[PDB]
Design a protein around this motif. Structure first.
Motif, PDB file in Angstrom:
ATOM      1  N   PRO A 568       0.832  -1.201   0.000  1.00  0.00           N
ATOM      2  CA  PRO A 568       0.000   0.000   0.000  1.00  0.00           C
ATOM      3  C   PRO A 568       0.858   1.238   0.000  1.00  0.00           C
ATOM      4  CG  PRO A 568      -0.586  -1.477   1.802  1.00  0.00           C
ATOM      5  CD  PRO A 568       0.760  -1.899   1.293  1.00  0.00           C
ATOM      6  N   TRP A 570       1.790   4.774   1.387  1.00  0.00           N
ATOM      7  CA  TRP A 570       1.580   5.649   2.549  1.00  0.00           C
ATOM      8  C   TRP A 570       1.904   7.080   2.145  1.00  0.00           C
ATOM      9  CZ3 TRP A 570       0.784   4.816   8.018  1.00  0.00           C
ATOM     10  CH2 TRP A 570       1.070   5.944   8.815  1.00  0.00           C
ATOM     11  N   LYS A 591      -4.675   1.831  -1.496  1.00  0.00           N
ATOM     12  CA  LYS A 591      -4.351   0.402  -1.594  1.00  0.00           C
ATOM     13  C   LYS A 591      -5.137  -0.535  -2.533  1.00  0.00           C
ATOM     14  CE  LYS A 591      -5.136  -3.242   1.573  1.00  0.00           C
ATOM     15  NZ  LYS A 591      -4.550  -4.335   2.389  1.00  0.00           N
ATOM     16  N   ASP A 594      -7.797  -5.076  -1.720  1.00  0.00           N
ATOM     17  CA  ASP A 594      -8.743  -5.514  -0.719  1.00  0.00           C
ATOM     18  C   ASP A 594     -10.046  -5.146  -1.391  1.00  0.00           C
ATOM     19  OD1 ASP A 594      -6.493  -5.937   0.747  1.00  0.00           O
ATOM     20  OD2 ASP A 594      -7.297  -5.030   2.577  1.00  0.00           O
ATOM     21  N   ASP A 599     -15.389  -2.617   3.154  1.00  0.00           N
ATOM     22  CA  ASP A 599     -14.976  -1.728   4.226  1.00  0.00           C
ATOM     23  C   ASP A 599     -15.896  -0.496   4.259  1.00  0.00           C
ATOM     24  OD1 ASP A 599     -12.307  -3.372   3.626  1.00  0.00           O
ATOM     25  OD2 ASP A 599     -11.794  -2.256   5.460  1.00  0.00           O
ATOM     26  N   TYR A 625     -13.264   5.350  10.564  1.00  0.00           N
ATOM     27  CA  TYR A 625     -12.379   6.239   9.815  1.00  0.00           C
ATOM     28  C   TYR A 625     -12.827   6.385   8.338  1.00  0.00           C
ATOM     29  CZ  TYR A 625     -10.806   1.484   8.884  1.00  0.00           C
ATOM     30  OH  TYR A 625     -10.780   0.148   8.586  1.00  0.00           O
ATOM     31  N   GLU A 638      -8.170   6.708   5.311  1.00  0.00           N
ATOM     32  CA  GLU A 638      -7.701   7.794   6.147  1.00  0.00           C
ATOM     33  C   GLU A 638      -6.675   7.252   7.100  1.00  0.00           C
ATOM     34  OE1 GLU A 638      -9.606  10.413   9.870  1.00  0.00           O
ATOM     35  OE2 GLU A 638     -10.925   9.620   8.341  1.00  0.00           O
ATOM     36  N   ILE A 639      -5.585   7.980   7.280  1.00  0.00           N
ATOM     37  CA  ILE A 639      -4.626   7.532   8.262  1.00  0.00           C
ATOM     38  C   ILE A 639      -4.967   8.130   9.618  1.00  0.00           C
ATOM     39  CG2 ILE A 639      -2.281   7.575   9.064  1.00  0.00           C
ATOM     40  CD1 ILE A 639      -1.248   7.438   6.263  1.00  0.00           C
ATOM     41  N   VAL A 640      -5.381   7.289  10.562  1.00  0.00           N
ATOM     42  CA  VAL A 640      -5.592   7.814  11.905  1.00  0.00           C
ATOM     43  C   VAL A 640      -4.249   7.987  12.547  1.00  0.00           C
ATOM     44  CG1 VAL A 640      -6.487   7.323  14.191  1.00  0.00           C
ATOM     45  CG2 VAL A 640      -7.860   6.785  12.075  1.00  0.00           C
ATOM     46  N   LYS A 641      -3.966   9.214  12.977  1.00  0.00           N
ATOM     47  CA  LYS A 641      -2.643   9.530  13.489  1.00  0.00           C
ATOM     48  C   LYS A 641      -2.349   8.886  14.836  1.00  0.00           C
ATOM     49  CE  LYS A 641      -0.832  11.826  10.099  1.00  0.00           C
ATOM     50  NZ  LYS A 641       0.519  11.305  10.346  1.00  0.00           N
ATOM     51  N   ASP A 642      -1.113   8.419  14.980  1.00  0.00           N
ATOM     52  CA  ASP A 642      -0.638   7.870  16.244  1.00  0.00           C
ATOM     53  C   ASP A 642      -1.452   6.661  16.703  1.00  0.00           C
ATOM     54  OD1 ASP A 642       1.368   9.968  16.440  1.00  0.00           O
ATOM     55  OD2 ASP A 642      -0.245  11.330  17.100  1.00  0.00           O
ATOM     56  N   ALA A 643      -1.795   5.804  15.757  1.00  0.00           N
ATOM     57  CA  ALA A 643      -2.566   4.608  16.049  1.00  0.00           C
ATOM     58  C   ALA A 643      -1.706   3.423  15.742  1.00  0.00           C
ATOM     59  CB  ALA A 643      -3.862   4.568  15.273  1.00  0.00           C
ATOM     60  N   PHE A 719     -10.161   0.353  18.016  1.00  0.00           N
ATOM     61  CA  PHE A 719     -10.987   0.291  16.804  1.00  0.00           C
ATOM     62  C   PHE A 719     -10.508  -0.754  15.791  1.00  0.00           C
ATOM     63  CE2 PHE A 719      -7.751   3.429  15.827  1.00  0.00           C
ATOM     64  CZ  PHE A 719      -7.487   3.282  14.484  1.00  0.00           C
ATOM     65  N   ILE A 721     -10.106  -2.634  11.929  1.00  0.00           N
ATOM     66  CA  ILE A 721      -9.784  -2.219  10.566  1.00  0.00           C
ATOM     67  C   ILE A 721      -9.821  -3.400   9.596  1.00  0.00           C
ATOM     68  CG2 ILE A 721      -8.288  -0.337  11.223  1.00  0.00           C
ATOM     69  CD1 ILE A 721      -5.927  -2.175  10.551  1.00  0.00           C
ATOM     70  N   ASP A 722      -9.578  -3.150   8.318  1.00  0.00           N
ATOM     71  CA  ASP A 722      -9.517  -4.233   7.366  1.00  0.00           C
ATOM     72  C   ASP A 722     -10.688  -5.212   7.369  1.00  0.00           C
ATOM     73  OD1 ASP A 722      -8.120  -5.156   5.240  1.00  0.00           O
ATOM     74  OD2 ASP A 722      -6.902  -6.598   6.403  1.00  0.00           O
TER      75      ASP A 722
END
Ligand SMILES: CC(C)(O)Cn1cc(-c2ccc3c(c2)OCCc2sc(-c4ncnn4CC(F)(F)F)nc2-3)cn1
Length: 833
Positions: A568, A570, A591, A594, A599, A625, A638-643, A719, A721-722
């Protein structure tokens, strides 16, 4: 049509991802008839919409502010920071104060508006500040309301360019033809012709089995048992080849109420190694490889109870959507149809009891509909309204009364159900429908609704040969009225996603899967990305999953290829808005492959579960997200920050091989907190987010996951994902989670008791919308997932929400499920070898 009204259609085609003027895959003119039929609703909404409110698209809600947000307002006092150029001054405002009111109290030169810093969001309109979603967003997450004072955008930028027989029905089956047939050995084949209406076969005829060759001719007249007059509008001539190999459909009554007559050569769909693609009236575009069938048609139309029985009817009326009606049930519903009409919850069942294969009855049924007082006056029941729009109803009149109830939805709510309503277009017999026009209408009236309408439609167009044409005509209709301003935004967006997707795929192909990356790869990536930026990456573009944000230039140093088997991208962008108060990048994962439609749907259902919990004043802290499916097995995240992944937190240790350890989650939280109070807020956030994801994941039957697919934020938010995939466990309540709750195998605690209590409330709260949940789930499977069991999985939901049980059993059923997670521990987790 001038020369600059033709280079426009080329622009619409590239924005759609399909050419709606292409008449290569049609056997009639329905699609073109619908393009013309939509001109009136398009211009009718374009002309009645307020240029000013439309240009700013205020995001408002009329629902009461929840309890959990009230307690964040100890005072009656909401603070709003305002900025000009450099400095700024804060203000104490009443939750009931209008944008106009706060404006006058700042001055205390009268044509200024309140935009949100960094965003294209506006606090405009005659609505309490408490009724703006952006405000409500801030209050929850403990964020501060910051606004900039500038001039309203010019409504001129939204300008729209100008425009301009008792005989028994019978079909002759000439034969079936296919260029190439091999595999293996040699079978026998026959054609099966069904007369369908709302998943009800009215009559059924086969041919004689003939040897299977590249040309099989029959010249057979199949005479059905249904008279021509007894054919209902929307009925389908379903043609299928068995040895089941191929299928194709033909509306028997066309879009002009004309009986289908004449010669037809239909190219059929194959079956891939029940689902909404089998209902489509579209024929296979691929004329060189597909099986075709040749037919002939030559035959205009539509031209007081004993207590005990009531108890039976009520019992019937009381059942779930998925409870099959018996012959006995249906004859009872019909015979007492005037009494049945007094109960809106009986409508789906009542209109399913209708014998649509008989004219006198459909007529009596239409009589029933003209005495629609109770239904009209009933409060809008989205679940009840959705049932009448699924595959089980082909009568446009029945379906029209559901879309009727939909008209009273405010934009907030339309946004909640937009995705599944768009998917619901697949269940429509005809390309032009009240549902289709509704979407078109609401989409033109509101930019936010329009923005998502665009991507949901474009999503389906890109990866559904079955329904891309219909969706293409609709999207075109929208694009011809959204205005030049958004036509430009979309253009910008489409330009950027397509370019990055080339880059995503070109990078995946370059690198062999497993080794991993892989240095030239990281270098070539930064190079392609350098090439796009000068030039030409659109200078700025709306983040498709957050139309408020305008991404700017790439931050090529932070951009990379992730260490996954699917490579994927980034990506990181700078916010194109200078007035933004933060220096954070916009994080996006691109990405393939999938199926991100799964999703998209799941996530949306999560958002629906939140709004449901909001009605009961609950906040289970979900992180649905952003996620847009853009093509076939490809889209953005969406990139969730600091996850980080739960699995990454266990492998902060040497051992490897999934030797999981219990104490770590609570430590990880301790390192990542500056104070101890924030740590306590993280523990509390975890207990709510874990509770929420345990309940929803259990209901949707996607609760059994590997901790590589479960994430947590440094702020303590759990949370999943995927979703686009998918001994036994109800959900994930691993021992490491319990440790954060103050338990480790067979004990209890003030936080765990809280967890158990919140789940049951949440669980019982979703069961009050059982029907809505069932119908959404059932629809999700039909339009979103690989061919399934138009029984068993839907059946699993019935069980999960424990349909027909009292509230007490349910509370325990779920408590049992919590214990199954405790009794299994790491077993299932450890297995996810
Ligand atoms: C952003 C930082 C630097 O602060 C920390 N960081 C965040 C991530 C990260 C990774 C994956 C996701 C993410 C933040 O956002 C949360 C939402 C989702 S959904 C999702 C996903 N869906 C399907 N597959 N995947 C994972 C992948 F993208 F790898 F395929 N991945 C992420 C990694 N480091």
């Amino acid at each position: 049509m001038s020369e600059e009204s033709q280079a426009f259609q080329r622009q619409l085609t590239a924005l759609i991802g399909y050419d709606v003027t292409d008449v290569s895959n049609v056997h009639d003119d329905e699609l073109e008839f619908t393009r013309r039929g939509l001109v009136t609703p398009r211009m009718a909404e374009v002309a009645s919409r307020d240029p000013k409110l439309y240009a700013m698209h205020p995001w408002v809600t009329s629902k009461p502010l929840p309890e959990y947000l009230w307690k964040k307002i100890a005072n009656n006092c909401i603070f709003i920071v305002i900025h000009r150029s450099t400095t700024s001054q804060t203000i104490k405002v009443s939750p009931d104060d209008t944008p106009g009111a706060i404006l006058q109290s700042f001055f205390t030169e009268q044509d200024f508006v309140l935009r949100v810093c960094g965003r294209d969001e506006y606090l405009v309109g005659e609505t309490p500040i408490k009724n703006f979603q952006w405000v409500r967003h801030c209050l929850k997450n403990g964020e501060e309301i910051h606004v900039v004072l500038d001039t309203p955008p010019d409504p001129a930028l939204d300008e729209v360019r100008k425009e301009e027989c008792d005989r028994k029905f019978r079909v002759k089956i000439r034969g079936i033809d296919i260029p190439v047939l091999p595999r293996n050995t040699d079978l026998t084949v026959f054609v099966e012709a069904n007369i369908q209406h709302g998943q009800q076969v009215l009559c059924q005829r086969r041919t004689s089995p003939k040897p299977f060759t590249e040309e099989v001719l029959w010249n057979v007249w199949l005479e059905f048992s249904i008279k021509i007059k007894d054919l209902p509008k929307g009925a389908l001539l379903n043609l299928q080849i068995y040895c089941l190999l191929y299928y194709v459909n033909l509306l028997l009554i066309d879009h002009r109420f004309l009986l289908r007559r004449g010669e037809y050569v239909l190219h059929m769909w194959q079956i891939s190694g029940f689902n909404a693609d089998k209902l489509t009236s579209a024929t296979n575009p691929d004329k060189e490889n597909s099986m075709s069938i040749s037919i002939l048609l030559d035959n205009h139309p539509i031209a007081e109870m004993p207590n005990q029985l009531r108890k039976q009817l009520e019992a019937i009326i009381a059942t779930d959507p998925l409870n099959p009606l018996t012959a006995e049930d249906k004859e009872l519903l019909w015979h007492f149809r005037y009494e049945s009409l007094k109960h809106p919850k009986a409508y789906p069942k009542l209109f399913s009891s209708v014998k649509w294969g008989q004219q006198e009855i459909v007529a009596k049924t239409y009589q029933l509909l003209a005495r629609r007082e109770v239904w009209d006056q009933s409060a809008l029941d989205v679940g009840l309204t959705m049932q009448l729009l699924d595959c089980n109803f082909s009568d446009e009149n029945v379906r029209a009364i559901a879309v009727q109830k939909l008209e009273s939805l405010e934009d907030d709510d339309v946004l909640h159900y937009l995705l599944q309503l768009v998917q619901a277009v697949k269940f429509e017999p005809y390309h032009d429908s009240a549902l289709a026009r509704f979407l078109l209408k609401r989409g033109l009236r509101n930019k936010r609704i329009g923005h998502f309408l665009f991507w949901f439609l474009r999503s389906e167009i890109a990866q559904s040969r079955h329904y891309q044409q219909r969706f293409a005509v609709i999207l075109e209709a929208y694009l011809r009225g959204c205005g030049t301003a958004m036509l430009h935004d979309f253009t910008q967006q489409v330009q950027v996603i397509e370019m990055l997707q080339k880059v995503t795929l070109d990078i995946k192909s370059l690198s062999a899967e497993k080794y991993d990356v892989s240095s030239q790869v990281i270098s070539q990536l930064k190079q392609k990305l350098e090439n796009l930026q000068n030039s030409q990456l659109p200078e700025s573009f709306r983040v498709p999953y957050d139309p408020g944000l305008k991404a700017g230039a790439l931050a090529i140093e932070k951009c990379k290829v992730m260490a996954s088997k699917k490579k994927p991208l980034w990506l990181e962008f700078k916010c194109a808005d200078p007035t933004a108060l933060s220096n954070e990048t916009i994080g996006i994962i691109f990405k393939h492959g999938d199926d991100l439609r799964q999703d998209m749907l799941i996530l949306q259902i999560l958002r629906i579960m939140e709004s449901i919990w909001e009605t009961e004043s609950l906040d289970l802290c979900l992180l649905p997200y952003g996620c847009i499916s853009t093509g076939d097995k490809i889209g953005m995240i969406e990139i969730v920050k600091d996850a980080t992944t739960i699995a990454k937190i266990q492998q902060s240790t040497v051992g490897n091989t999934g030797a999981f350890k219990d104490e770590v989650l609570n430590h990880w939280l301790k390192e990542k907190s500056p104070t101890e109070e924030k740590f306590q807020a993280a523990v509390e956030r975890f207990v709510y987010s874990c509770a929420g994801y345990c309940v929803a994941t259990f209901v949707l039957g996607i609760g059994d996951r590997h901790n590589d697919n479960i994430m947590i934020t440094e702020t303590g938010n759990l949370f999943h994902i995927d979703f686009g995939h998918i001994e036994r466990v109800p959900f994930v309540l691993t021992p490491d989670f319990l440790f954060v709750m103050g338990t480790s195998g067979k004990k209890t605690s003030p936080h765990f008791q809280k967890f158990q209590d919140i789940c049951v409330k949440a669980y019982l709260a979703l069961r009050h919308h059982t029907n809505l949940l069932i119908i959404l789930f059932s629809m999700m499977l039909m339009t979103g997932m690989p061919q399934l069991t138009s029984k068993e999985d839907i059946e699993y939901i019935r069980d999960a929400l424990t349909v027909g049980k009292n509230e007490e059993d349910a509370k325990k059923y779920f408590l049992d499920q919590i214990e199954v997670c405790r009794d299994k521990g790491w077993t299932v987790q450890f297995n996810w070898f």
